[PDB]
């Protein structure tokens, strides 16, 4: 709230949730949009999927966990071969 001023994302969240037939997907898409926008300005919301959009956080593979800062340059050692 000290950086992004969510006052403009709130009305859009309501609009999308009320409009689309599959409301939960639009709800999560709208929240993820604000999360991406805030992360763009240095403030990262770690662990924001615990009450609202945690429908796939726990579905990750056995040794692979859900992340919030997954990056392109974090692939297998095949990528490290070129690097």
């Amino acid at each position: 709230h000290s950086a992004v001023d969510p006052a403009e994302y709130y009305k859009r969240c309501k609009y999308d949730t009320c409009n689309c037939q599959n409301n939960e997907d639009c709800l999560c898409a709208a929240l993820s949009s604000y999360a991406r926008a805030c992360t763009a300005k240095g403030v990262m919301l770690w662990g924001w999927r615990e009450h609202v959009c945690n429908k796939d956080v726990g579905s990750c593979p056995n040794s692979q966990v859900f992340l919030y800062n997954l990056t392109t340059c974090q692939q297998t050692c095949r990528s490290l071969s070129e690097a």
Binding site: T17, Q21, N23, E24
Partner: protein, 83 residues
């Protein structure tokens, strides 16, 4: 020609908090015509004299057909149609 069940299922309303399953098609039961005399006698009594010309008779008696056989024991379904 839409069957009643599918046509009714078309008019469903989606609440974005609960998922409710539509009723499935049950096996077609025998035409409960063995109680037609009962419905015809009870419905066309003297108390209903001056309405034989206002309202039809076939639909309500047809409904009574299923009510009599689908509600064994207490007569809580038959006296709901004549009502």
């Amino acid at each position: 020609l839409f069957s009643p069940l599918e046509f009714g299922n078309m008019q469903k309303i989606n609440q974005p908090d609960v998922v409710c399953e539509d009723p499935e098609e049950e096996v077609a039961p025998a035409s409960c015509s063995e109680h037609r005399a009962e419905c015809e006698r009870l419905l066309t009594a003297e108390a209903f004299a001056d309405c034989q010309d206002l309202v039809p008779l076939e639909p309500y008696l047809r409904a009574c057909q299923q009510d009599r056989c689908r509600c064994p024991g207490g007569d809580t379904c038959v006296c709901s149609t004549v009502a």
